[PDB]
Amino acid sequence: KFWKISTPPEAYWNREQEKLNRQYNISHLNYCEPDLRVTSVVTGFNNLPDRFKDFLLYLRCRNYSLLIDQPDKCAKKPFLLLAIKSLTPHFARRQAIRESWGQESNGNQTVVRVFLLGQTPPEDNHPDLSDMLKFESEKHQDILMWNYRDTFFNLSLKEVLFLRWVSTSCPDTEFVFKGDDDVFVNTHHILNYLNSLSKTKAKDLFIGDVIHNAGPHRDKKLKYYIPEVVYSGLYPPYAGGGGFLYSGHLALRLYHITDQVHLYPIDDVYTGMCLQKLGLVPEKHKGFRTFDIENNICSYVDLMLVHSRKPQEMIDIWSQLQSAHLKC
Amino acid sequence: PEAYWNREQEKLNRQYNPILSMLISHLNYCEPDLRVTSVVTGFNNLPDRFKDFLLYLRCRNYSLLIDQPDKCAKKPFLLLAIKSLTPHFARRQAIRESWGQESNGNQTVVRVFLLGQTPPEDNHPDLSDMLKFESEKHQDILMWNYRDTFFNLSLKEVLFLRWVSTSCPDTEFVFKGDDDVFVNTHHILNYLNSLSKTKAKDLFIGDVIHNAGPHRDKKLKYYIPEVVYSGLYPPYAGGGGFLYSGHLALRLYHITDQVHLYPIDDVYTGMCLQKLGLVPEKHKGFRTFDIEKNNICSYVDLMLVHSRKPQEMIDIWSQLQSAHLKC
Ligand SMILES: *[C@@H]1O[C@H](CO)[C@@H](O[C@@H]2O[C@H](CO)[C@@H](O[C@@H]3O[C@H](CO[C@H]4O[C@H](CO)[C@@H](O)[C@H](O)[C@@H]4O)[C@@H](O)[C@H](O[C@H]4O[C@H](CO)[C@@H](O)[C@H](O)[C@@H]4O)[C@@H]3O)[C@H](O)[C@H]2NC(C)=O)[C@H](O)[C@H]1NC(C)=O
Ligand SMILES: *[C@@H]1O[C@H](CO)[C@@H](O[C@@H]2O[C@H](CO)[C@@H](O[C@@H]3O[C@H](CO[C@H]4O[C@H](CO)[C@@H](O)[C@H](O)[C@@H]4O)[C@@H](O)[C@H](O[C@H]4O[C@H](CO)[C@@H](O)[C@H](O)[C@@H]4O)[C@@H]3O)[C@H](O)[C@H]2NC(C)=O)[C@H](O)[C@H]1NC(C)=O
Ligand SMILES: CC(C)Cn1c(=O)[nH]c2ccc(C(=O)O)cc21
Ligand SMILES: CC(C)Cn1c(=O)[nH]c2ccc(C(=O)O)cc21
Ligand SMILES: *[C@@H]1O[C@H](CO)[C@@H](O)[C@H](O)[C@H]1NC(C)=O
Ligand SMILES: [Cl-]
């Protein structure tokens, strides 16, 4: 017996995910009243931070409604769909993107853009910016908003509901980029990389800054902290950072398999789990510079995205980039 | 006088002295003052903010792009003037809900936000259509035509003091602060009512700094090189806010025409106060220091605390509305 250090608990996620695999080889998808069982099953439940309590309690609900929609966003077959994760108060970040690399363009290559939002509700001491979000939505017509609590641990929900929106409203798009609103993207380089793709490599395309043999952080005071009570083992290969790039074909496969993967607090890992269940490994690509602080305008020519750029820098870097095929 | 600001201010004092004058181009000259390139040593190596500052110093003829004329139609006991930048939409809205609430008995409290321009030529995102929507909805945006930069915050003060002079002269008091500062508006109105009519008409309190001089480390945000300013700073109320009388505000605006703008706004206010022969009064309640204990009691007897995020402001205000029981 383990009298020294306590027995390592069986994690609630792994236990429920194997339970879910047998079911497949809907009480986990639309059950939206609190699942109070976890308060007994999960050891040490009442000391877990509040985000962990909410995640476990509402993990089996994902049929949230679309409050703001852009139905005609793909009335023309998109070659590339830009899906930017954003929060309600980030009006500056979103507008810089509309003016820089997030520009919608059109010849046979139509590029369209949407911003993915939840709610920042008053119960969480957020300022009421809803009427402003509507005005922004009527003006630019690129706001998607569902009625879930847009929190860090609900980002898997943001993934699934976006994928569901793809399947139900933009399934014809040839390609899909998804990422953060504080990243700079060389949409020129992307469209070039996309147009250089063999139809073979294009069908199952998924590329980004893939991290292998990673594990949940157990340091309680860290952002990406997951205790062994929640998840045990190592993460699958997953493309993290502020963006990855994939085909619309794989997007439909990703959506269908989401029903078979329980939500996970780290969204970029969840998309890797779905990739695993489909039999695929994300493709690491050197142009996905997760790291790089900051001139050197030639560097931005060679890359696909750099992480952490302020709204002014996004428009500055994109302005220089326009004539960059002379300075480099 | 080797340093430029001292020298031109000396030229400015002589101009305004009745004797020394006898042997508006410092207010309305809105072409670049190219003379600073020949006179300020090493001008070409000064950072761009110092360049634009020295070149356009002699201009403050900047018009109001968005006005709230009826803001002070009802005489206010306290005017809330908050310095803000265009994209700070969440900062302002959180204040509107927490401590910047406007209320009508005699102690009417009103609130304005003081904005310049974040123009596209500086690679800013165009949020004008959004800012105008905010003004229609909340009737509290004041926007002038000038580059809202750090070294231009003295301009924000002079133009605002002008706006008080024309459009809100009868306010009894004025709070002036940042948009990332929590202000116990309740404790403010209490303190203000505890004031004799003596201390209440030359009132100007805050986190006052004495014995202060310019930072000379080229890396600091508040760096000021010896070619620009030599000597100590006066007593000035630094930090994220201060509070004063509307009467003193009218005096301050009249004395701005005789003080060259300074790249640090907190210092420019004290310089105007020194020309009025007054001294800002230090106050314990202006804690630009406490930044996160977690007892709501720490907010009951403070005027102002810096800095807070927009969620933090709304949360602090709610716990404050019920701290009479707990504390
Ligand atoms: C991801 O996003 C989802 C979508 O919003 C979030 O899910 C919500 O989570 C919140 C909690 O953060 C849930 O709100 C809570 O619901 C509890 C149960 O509600 C039932 O009971 C009430 C009253 O009995 C009925 O009116 C109602 O119809 C339901 O039948 C309440 O007990 C909670 O009350 C809490 O707040 C009050 C004050 O507001 C306190 O006084 C209480 O003590 C208590 O603490 C609260 O209302 C909400 O139900 C969930 N929504 C859905 C659709 O499921 C996830 O939280 C989020 N995940 C993460 C990790 O952020
Ligand atoms: C505080 O806020 C004020 C108010 O906005 C700022 O003052 C403005 O500062 C900008 C520069 O930052 C000034 O704009 C510059 O004006 C120069 C002078 O233009 C006159 O002269 C030329 C030559 O005869 C004429 O062509 C022109 O029509 C004017 O008659 C311009 O030369 C500058 O042009 C720059 O941009 C071009 C691109 O268009 C570049 O290619 C050039 O190389 C050049 O760098 C520039 O437009 C503006 O005039 C100021 N406004 C006022 C009212 O004075 C302060 O800068 C700000 N202070 C701080 C510290 O931020
Ligand atoms: C680029 C971000 C805008 C992504 N994001 C998003 O869409 N919703 C989010 C909620 C919380 C956090 C966090 O890390 O705190 C981050 C979030
Ligand atoms: C809203 C506050 C942040 C104060 N502020 C303001 O009103 N206008 C400003 C321009 C620049 C800077 C800076 O710190 O660089 C700060 C500014
Ligand atoms: C999800 O579906 C169930 C089943 O009809 C329903 O009761 C519940 O309200 C739905 N949840 C949301 C958030 O709409
Ligand atoms: Cl903000």
PDB file of C-alpha atoms in Angstrom, chain B residues 98 182 186 296 316-324:
ATOM      1  CA  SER B  98     -18.600  51.513 -11.727  1.00  0.00           C
ATOM      2  CA  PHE B 182     -10.027  52.993  -9.590  1.00  0.00           C
ATOM      3  CA  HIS B 186     -17.990  58.029  -2.730  1.00  0.00           C
ATOM      4  CA  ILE B 296     -12.286  45.331   0.304  1.00  0.00           C
ATOM      5  CA  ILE B 316     -14.312  46.426  -6.783  1.00  0.00           C
ATOM      6  CA  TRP B 317     -17.258  48.813  -7.080  1.00  0.00           C
ATOM      7  CA  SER B 318     -19.801  46.095  -6.238  1.00  0.00           C
ATOM      8  CA  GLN B 319     -17.935  44.889  -3.144  1.00  0.00           C
ATOM      9  CA  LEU B 320     -17.583  48.557  -2.145  1.00  0.00           C
ATOM     10  CA  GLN B 321     -21.351  49.168  -2.254  1.00  0.00           C
ATOM     11  CA  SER B 322     -21.669  46.672   0.689  1.00  0.00           C
ATOM     12  CA  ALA B 323     -18.485  47.315   2.681  1.00  0.00           C
ATOM     13  CA  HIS B 324     -20.305  49.381   5.314  1.00  0.00           C
TER      14      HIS B 324
END
